[PDB]
């Protein structure tokens, strides 16, 4: 039914990598170090992958567990059916920006939340819980006007 990212969200046309491998993408483990917006306290995130599109995070209260498919209308974007240990539900939008696979990954997430107005933000994964923010990203950081993403709980 759903067919596009939720209005307000950022599609981001013109602005995404060429060639998006999402078979070298979902695989292994995803450090969330940093991003443009962030709470307190800032925790680690590590995002577990699995076969067709399946994570597990431990997030703000417990394991989250998600299970995600391609929007058909957006291309890039991926939508997430999440389920919480508090027995919360919520869907979130996400699209691969840039990444190297081997060590870094920004994403841009985008979801209603049960609201009208969209939350969104700009995500750096790391394959490692140590890793920062690369050099080559630099002018893609700048061209986004992401000068200064805030480090979260991971070393
Ligand atoms: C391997 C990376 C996979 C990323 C998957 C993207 C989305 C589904 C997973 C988690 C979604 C979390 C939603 C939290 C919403 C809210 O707390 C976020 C505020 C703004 C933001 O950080 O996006
Ligand atoms: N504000 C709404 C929606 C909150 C919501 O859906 N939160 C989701 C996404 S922020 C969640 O439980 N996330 C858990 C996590 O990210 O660890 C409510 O309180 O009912």
């Not at 979130?92 to 994403?107: G, H, I």
């Amino acid at each position: 039914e759903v067919t596009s990212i939720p209005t307000g969200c950022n599609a981001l046309s013109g602005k995404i990598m060429s060639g998006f491998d999402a078979n070298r993408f979902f695989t292994g483990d995803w450090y969330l170090t940093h991003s443009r917006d962030s709470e307190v306290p800032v925790r680690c995130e590590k995002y577990q992958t699995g076969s067709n599109l399946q994570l597990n995070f431990n997030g703000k209260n417990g394991d989250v567990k998600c299970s995600g498919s391609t929007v058909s209308g957006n291309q890039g974007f991926y939508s997430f059916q999440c389920t919480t240990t508090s027995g919360g539900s919520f869907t979130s939008y996400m699209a691969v920006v840039e990444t190297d696979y081997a060590n870094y990954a920004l994403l841009y997430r985008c979801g209603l939340y049960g609201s009208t107005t969209p939350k969104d933000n700009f995500l750096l994964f790391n394959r490692q819980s140590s890793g920062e923010i690369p050099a080559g990203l630099s002018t893609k950081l700048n061209q986004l006007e992401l000068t200064s993403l805030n480090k979260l709980g991971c070393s």
